[PDB]
Each structure stands twice: as C-alpha cells, then as structure tokens.
C-alpha cells in the first residue's frame, strides 16, 4: 500500500525491545523504567519526571517538505488536570523544529523557525474533563505538513484545525526525538503512545481513515478507555445514555440506580466476563463472543440473567427484565454475545441474546418509576439508538480516585 511505503520512521515492538521497522534503521534507546507493551503492542508508558525514549534519525532521510506523524495517546486524569504545561515529545534543538505539548486539558502541536516564531495546531482532548471528553482515553492524532503551506491536525480521523505556514521562515529539523517528561510530577502523572509512525507524504484524509481504521483493531471490545476489553476482569457496566447510574438488584431485578456522587466514576457491584468457550484466562474479548456475566453482590457472585417472563403480566417487541441467578454455570439463559459500535468518540457494544428468542440489551424506563436494563425482541429499529450502547469502566492507572 501506498501509505505503509510512506512511512520513514515506525516504532514497534518487536523481541522485547521498542525498535525502527521502517527500515531505514533509526536508533532507538529506551530508558530503563519505561513500559512497554503493557496495553497494545507497540505503546510504552511515560510518567515519573526522567525516563524517556530517545530515538535517533539517520542521513538516509532525501529532506524536503510534505510529512505526516501519526500515533494514539492516552493521557491520566491527574495529568490533564495539572494547569502546567508540559513537553511530551520533543525535536528542538537550538530553537528550531517541532514537539508536542499538554497544556490544561490540551494537546498542542508546535513548529517554530529559526527566528523562534511558531504557528500550533491545538485540541481540547478534555474538554473539562467531560465524560464524553477523552481524558484518559486512547483517541488517534495525526499532523501532516505540506508545501503549499499547510499544517493540520487530525483527530480519530477528522481534521480539527488546519494552519498555513506564515510568519514562518526555516524551520531546521534535527535527527532527535525525545519522549518523555522531565518536569516533576505525581507518582499518578502520566500517559501512553503507540503505533508512532512519521510518513514521507502528505496523507489524505482518505489515507489517515485507512490507517486509523486499521490500528483501532476494529475486532476487539475495547473497554471505557479504548484498551481492550479481557475475560476474567472487573468492569463497572454502565448504559451510554446513563454515565452516572449503575447495575443493582435492588428488587428481584437488576436497576440503574444513582450515582450518589457522580464526580465518581468507580461505583457499583464491578462485573466479571467469562468466556463460555475455553479461552486463556484473561486474553481479549472478540466481538461475535458468547460470554456470561457475574455480579459481586455482597461477598457472592451472581450470573446475570434475562428473564422467561415479560416485563408486565406478549407475541411481538417483546420486554424481559434481567435478573441474578445463583446457580454458576454455562447456561444458556445466561449466555450473551457482544458487538463493537463504529464511533469516532465513544468505546462501547451491544450485548445480544440468542436464548429463546433474539434479544438485544437497552436500558430505559418502562413502568415507582425505575431506570431498567432489559432484553427486548425485533430489535432492528433500535440497532442505532445510543440506549443499547453498553461501555465497561475498568480500574485504569489512568483514573485515580
């Protein structure tokens, strides 16, 4: 493909070390407190103010004009909020070159000459750190430069600003990248990066697409934060449409009950998913996977069910409530397949149910008057409404609370 022959500088994992695969052989020297792979294969951690990554360029880049660099991020809670700005990826040598900074909720793209001018791309990733905002959430950038002037910025595929290079004179590039942060911070400041890929041309909005598409690893349930979703793993549940309610019995049925402080995120009976086929302990959940789900309920796990009955005491559109069962085993009424949505800005699936007859998760009110996760039938017509969207929070080093 034309855009893979692009790329002049590809950081990937490869034995157990972050290396160049670009081919053009980049020296590449990893600190020794940095983590690597932790979450997806090619990422590594920054934080404590020292460990970096220091990559080293060589002669075979022919310099000119059209670039692009492309890589995913996730930025802690305690970092976004922090109002200091901070330099995470650094190619400046005297005064001259590019890095990319972290200002109050804000990523920020730099370039600045030689007369020390700058132009910056920016983007509200928190966005006070709204639930809908991406605080510590994985979400792809990409910056490509051009030679009729122009440098833009893209966020999961949509451009968000686009500059033309003005009161900009020579902008002399170096054959150093540095990543990581010196500044002192928290023991809980920090972020991750993987897939950094720096690519010889100009992408189309077209080709940024094909690569976003293709590193989000659109088989994999991902999790609140956009890390995948594993088996054998505690997840707080949560409906699309209610961030701030969470799964209780309360009544012989499951409920959205309240958040009795939604500034919190972590609240609830924390969820485990098994797999229903043997699968190693907690490897990736795939969509198109049958699973079972145990409540933590008072020192017992209980498997979520769907109910026989109807909701009210039906032939079509059909309305079951979900209940906890006891018994722990591979039962069908308890066996439920799970589904990716395709969504620039929201990590979440639907549940299904194949039991009796096809059924999909949603949660709404029906009925004194109660939020209820339920299982309803001809489901075609809700397959797009946000209520049958289902997001797992798990416990993430980049949340604390």
């Keep these: 493909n034309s855009i893979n022959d692009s790329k002049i500088l590809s950081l990937q994992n490869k034995k157990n070390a972050l290396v160049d695969t670009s081919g053009y052989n980049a020296e590449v020297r990893v600190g020794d407190n ?3 792979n932790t979450i997806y294969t090619n990422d590594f951690k920054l934080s404590s103010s020292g460990d970096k990554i220091i990559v080293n360029l060589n002669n075979n880049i022919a ?8 890589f995913w991020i996730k930025i802690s809670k305690d970092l976004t909020n922090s109002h200091n700005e901070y330099t995470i990826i650094n190619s400046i040598e005297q005064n001259s070159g590019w890095k990319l900074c972290i200002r109050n909720g804000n990523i920020e793209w730099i370039l600045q000459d030689v007369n020390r001018k700058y132009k910056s791309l920016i983007f509200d990733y928190s966005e006070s ?6 605080t510590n959430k994985w979400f792809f950038v990409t910056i490509t430069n051009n030679i009729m002037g122009y440098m833009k910025l893209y966020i999961n595929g949509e451009l968000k600003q686009s500059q033309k ?3 900009l004179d020579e902008v002399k590039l170096d054959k150093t990248i540095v990543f990581g942060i010196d500044e002192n911070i928290d023991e809980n400041q920090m972020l991750w990066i993987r897939d950094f890929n720096i690519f010889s041309k100009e992408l189309s909005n077209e080709d940024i697409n ?4 293709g590193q989000i690893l659109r088989n994999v349930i991902k999790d609140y934060w956009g890390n995948p979703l594993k088996f054998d793993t505690e997840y707080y549940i949560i409906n699309d449409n209610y961030i701030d309610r969470y799964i209780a019995p309360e009544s012989n049925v499951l409920v959205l009950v309240q958040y009795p402080d939604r500034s919190k995120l972590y609240t609830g009976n924390p969820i485990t998913i098994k797999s229903v086929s043997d699968k190693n302990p907690y490897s990736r959940i795939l ?3 049958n699973i079972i789900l145990h409540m933590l309920y008072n020192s017992r796990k209980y498997m979520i ?5 109807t909701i009210y005491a039906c032939s079509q559109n059909c309305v079951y409530a979900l209940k906890l069962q006891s018994n722990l085993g591979n039962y069908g009424i308890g066996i439920f397949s799970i589904k990716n949505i395709v969504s620039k800005n929201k990590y979440c699936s639907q549940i299904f149910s194949s ?6 998760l949603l949660a709404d009110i029906y009925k004194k008057n109660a939020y209820t996760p339920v299982a309803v039938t001809n489901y075609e017509t809700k397959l797009l409404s946000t209520s049958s969207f289902w997001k797992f929070i798990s416990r993430d080093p980049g949340w604390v609370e």
Aim: overall charge negative; charged content about 25%.
């Design 34 to 36: 940095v983590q690597l």
């Design 63 to 70: 310099i000119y004009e059209n670039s692009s660099v492309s």
């Design 129 to 134: 750190l709204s639930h809908t905002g991406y």
């Design 165 to 167: 290079i003005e009161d």
């Design 210 to 213: 094909i690569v976003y598409e």
């Design 287 to 289: 969509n198109g996977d």
């Design 305 to 309: 069910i769907r109910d026989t009955d």
């Design 355 to 360: 039991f009796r007859e096809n059924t999909m």
